[PDB]
Amino acid sequence: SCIQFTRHASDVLLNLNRLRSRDILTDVVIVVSREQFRAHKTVLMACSGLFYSIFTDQLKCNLSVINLDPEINPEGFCILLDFMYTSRLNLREGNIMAVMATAMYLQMEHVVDTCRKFIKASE
Amino acid sequence: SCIQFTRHASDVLLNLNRLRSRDILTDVVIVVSREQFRAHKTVLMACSGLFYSIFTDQLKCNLSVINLDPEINPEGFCILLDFMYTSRLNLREGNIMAVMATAMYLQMEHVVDTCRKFIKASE
């Protein structure tokens, strides 16, 4: 018999992004080919199968620094980190290959799906 | 020129609630008249003006235990904590007064608004 507030999840995500922009309560640095990205472990886990697996590990859950595979492109990661905190994906002809490869590595199934569809349309 | 994934914010909140249910990466205990509630500081801040103010304080941001005012009803808090993580509010005739008072103290403006409207309809 609950009532539901339609905009609540969006408002929560908007506030989490405000915290990220002001570097409030960020608890991890993600290192991508020497570029560094500060974030909230819980948000990373909520968006990515890879971060979910990492931060549920009894040893890795306590790390303040995570280094990604050197093949990962920092711009592709930045675009995906922005998507995690906003639901908005900056998908462009020049970045789609790097974004899809990063989303496959991060295990972000819905992003991989839209990249596959956008690539298929251009062939 | 971004594309947007409609269900992303809801999916994020659903995963944050899964983390709460399994007590994963919870970093604070909220004490309400001896009842204890584990949660994520970032989610509490994203939903409540009171928690936002508390955890942006340079001393309180580091506390692992927060004690609420003894007038706060544990059931009212529990209902609001469930709403924070799900967008669903269990508003009932028997709890509406305790839920509204707790939402006013927590500074959850949209919850206060629907409680005022539901009370006004019954008068």
Partner: peptide, 4 residues
């Protein structure tokens, strides 16, 4: 607010 809605009935979900």
């Amino acid at each position: 607010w809605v009935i979900p």
